[PDB]
Amino acid sequence: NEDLRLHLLLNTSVTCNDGSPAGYYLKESRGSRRWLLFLEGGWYCFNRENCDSRYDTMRRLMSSRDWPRTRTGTGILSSQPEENPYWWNANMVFIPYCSSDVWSGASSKSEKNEYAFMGALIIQEVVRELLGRGLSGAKVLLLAGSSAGGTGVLLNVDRVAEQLEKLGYPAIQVRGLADSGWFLDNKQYRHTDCVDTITCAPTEAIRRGIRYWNGVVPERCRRQFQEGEEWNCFFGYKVYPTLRSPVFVVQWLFDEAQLTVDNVHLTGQPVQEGLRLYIQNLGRELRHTLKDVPASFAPACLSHEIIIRSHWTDVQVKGTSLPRALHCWDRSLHDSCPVHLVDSCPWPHCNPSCPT
Ligand SMILES: O=S(=O)(O)OC[C@H]1O[C@@](COS(=O)(=O)O)(O[C@H]2O[C@H](COS(=O)(=O)O)[C@@H](OS(=O)(=O)O)[C@H](OS(=O)(=O)O)[C@H]2OS(=O)(=O)O)[C@@H](OS(=O)(=O)O)[C@@H]1OS(=O)(=O)O
Ligand SMILES: *[C@@H]1O[C@H](CO)[C@@H](O)[C@H](O)[C@H]1NC(C)=O
Ligand SMILES: [Cl-]
């Protein structure tokens, strides 16, 4: 009705982890030449035993077999102007995450591999099918994503731009919006042994992950690191300087997933001093990485994801909402209103508009 409708890919050799077809949800808005393609997140798995666990626990993130027919767009995917002040009338696309690979996998599997990891190919296939359903008429394609989909934007936004240029669609301005996908490859609070997905230190997870997935990173970033050191390009502050497409970075300064991989678990128990200082330092490192990111929005809150959350309009930095900052960034790209909005206060909830 006003919901997005599911389409499984016509090419059924591009699959989710378990061999079922990948897909996308679409809501067309034929009065608009703006396209929002959203990449879903939800961790990853970097070896067979952890991928077998995720397949029993979270099969939705590995298979299309039970995806619903439609879904309602929320936050920046909402078609309601009250919920989505600047992009409500856009063509809306939600790409479910079923590849467990941070949108990096680019091969068909072997019969000898259990799982297929195809996220980068999924994105390319979605883009091609959208051409026949109106993307051919587009002037802007914003590739947005949360969490692993946020890092997936960083890995894929230039490939999507180069794909469309190569296909003969030079009018389409390709831009990225990376939400909660800007992580530090820092040391853990207390070092674990990488036996579970969530608790494996971030460097090691990606080091293992890129090999297990045969993941691909952007060439301009890859060229800056030694062979075998491609895992570097999964980290925002490393891949970002190489990106040609404009990219806006939304990142909580004390992101829950970042604390989780750093082996910190805040249950509402009293926060002791050692931990207190680790958390403070994390916020400061994260703010440092955003110093030369002119288009960014980074509140001092302990949270995770934002852009498809209904209450995304509630948070402010220096009296500027995120939708308003994204509108300023668009305005700034139209010519060829702050956009750098990073909290400087030192602890979760020092910003009074933080979600609860
Ligand atoms: O309903 S929409 O999704 O289409 O949003 C329309 C607004 O987008 C602008 C761009 O402004 S900005 O992103 O805030 O910087 O213009 C874009 O769309 C219009 C046509 O839409 S409209 O509803 O008839 O106004 C295009 O104008 S035109 O080509 O018909 O002349 C713009 O194309 S162009 O690059 O100027 O040629 C198009 O810009 S863009 O491709 O998105 O970068 C606003 O218009 S603007 O004033 O020219 O900058 C529209 O403003 S509105 O408040 O939603 O009406
Ligand atoms: C389908 O995708 C597979 C896997 O990427 C690719 O090898 C093949 O060429 C594609 N076939 C068609 C007909 O699009
Ligand atoms: Cl159809």
User: Nearest Cα to 304, choosing from 222, 193, 207, 183?
Assistant: 183
Q: Look at the alpha carbons of 64, 113, 99, 50 in this order and tell me if their dihedral is positive or negative.
A: positive
Total tally of structural domains belonging to the chain:
1
CA distance 154 to 147: 11
CA distance 1 to 62: 27
Amino acid at 92: M
Beta bridge partners of 21: 15
**If DSSP codes are grouped into helix, strand and coil, which group holds residue 304?**
coil
Radius of gyration of the chain (CA): 19
CA distance 101 to 121: 11
| Residue 138 contacts residue 153 (beta carbons within 8 Å) | no
SS (H, E, C) 246-295: CEEEECCCEEHHHHHHCCCCCCCCCCCHHHHHHHHHHHHHHHHHCCCCCC
User: Nearest Cα to 147, choosing from 71, 219, 198?
Assistant: 198
Of the chain, the end-to-end C-alpha distance in Å amounts to: 31
The C-alpha angle 133, 134, 137, rounded to 5 degrees, equals 160
Q: This structure's resolution (angstroms)?
A: 2.2
| Residue 104 contacts residue 155 (beta carbons within 8 Å) | yes
CA distance 116 to 107: 8
Q: State if residue 90 touches ligand 1 by the CB under 6 angstroms criterion.
A: yes
Q: How far is the CA of 194 from the centre of ligand 3 (A)?
A: 44
Residue carrying the six token digits 């030079």: 170
Q: Ligand 1 atom closest to Cα of 139?
A: 41
Amino acid at 209: G
Secondary-structure percent of the chain, ordered helix, strand, coil, rounded to 5: 35, 15, 50
Ligand number nearest CA of 116 is: 2
Q: Buried (b) or exposed (e) across 124-133, using 16+ Cβ within 10 A?
A: bbbbbbbbee
| Residue 262 contacts residue 282 (beta carbons within 8 Å) | yes
| Residue 284 contacts residue 347 (beta carbons within 8 Å) | no
Among protein residues, the one with the nearest Cα to ligand 2's atom 3 is: 13
CA distance 199 to 184: 14
Q: Ligand 2 atom closest to Cα of 121?
A: 5
Q: State if residue 32 touches ligand 1 by the CB under 6 angstroms criterion.
A: yes
Ligand number nearest CA of 32 is: 1
Phi, psi of 178 (to 5 degrees): -100, 110
CA distance 132 to 115: 30
β-strands 254-255, 296-298: how paired?
A: unpaired
Inter-axis angle of helices 148-167 and 119-132, nearest 10: 50
CA distance 255 to 261: 10
Q: How far is the CA of 324 from the centre of ligand 1 (A)?
A: 16
**If DSSP codes are grouped into helix, strand and coil, which group holds residue 86?**
coil
User: Nearest Cα to 305, choosing from 61, 75, 59, 3?
Assistant: 75
β-strands 173-179, 70-71: how paired?
A: unpaired
Q: How far is the CA of 6 from the centre of ligand 3 (A)?
A: 9
Q: Is residue 211 classed exposed, middle or buried when 0-12, 13-18 and 19+ CB atoms within 10 A define those classes?
A: middle
| Residue 250 contacts residue 296 (beta carbons within 8 Å) | yes
Q: Ligand 1 atom closest to Cα of 87?
A: 3
- Residues in CB range of 154: below 8 A, 6 or more apart: 176, 178, 181, 218, 236, 239, 240, 243, 247
β-strands 4-8, 70-71: how paired?
A: antiparallel
At 122, list the tokens: 């999924």
**If DSSP codes are grouped into helix, strand and coil, which group holds residue 307?**
coil
CA distance 40 to 96: 5
Counted residue by residue, the chain has a size of: 356
User: Nearest Cα to 253, choosing from 188, 349, 144?
Assistant: 349
**If DSSP codes are grouped into helix, strand and coil, which group holds residue 188?**
coil
User: Alpha carbon of 138 to those of 84, 134, 164, 257: distances in Å?
Assistant: 20, 7, 11, 34
For residue 110, give the DSSP letter.
P
Q: Look at the alpha carbons of 41, 301, 353, 345 in this order and tell me if their dihedral is positive or negative.
A: negative
List helix spans (H) across 198-255. 202-213, 219-222, 236-239
Q: How many CA atoms lie within 13 A of 289 on its CB side?
A: 23
For residue 233, give the DSSP letter.
G
Catalytic residues: 147, 255, 304
β-strands 320-321, 296-298: how paired?
A: unpaired
Domain span at residue 269 reads 1-356
Q: Look at the alpha carbons of 16, 19, 20, 22 in this order and tell me if their dihedral is positive or negative.
A: positive
Q: State if residue 144 touches ligand 1 by the CB under 6 angstroms criterion.
A: no
Q: How far is the CA of 94 from the centre of ligand 3 (A)?
A: 16
Q: How far is CA 101 from the centre of its chain?
A: 12
Residues in contact with ligand 2 (CB, 6 Å cut-off): 11, 13-14, 108, 121
Among protein residues, the one with the nearest Cα to ligand 1's atom 13 is: 330
**If DSSP codes are grouped into helix, strand and coil, which group holds residue 163?**
helix
E-only strand ranges, the chain: 4-8, 23-27, 34-39, 70-71, 91-95, 140-146, 173-179, 247-250, 254-255, 296-298, 302-303, 316-317, 320-321, 340-342
Amino acid at 341: L
Ligand number nearest CA of 24 is: 3
At 216, list the tokens: 């691909």
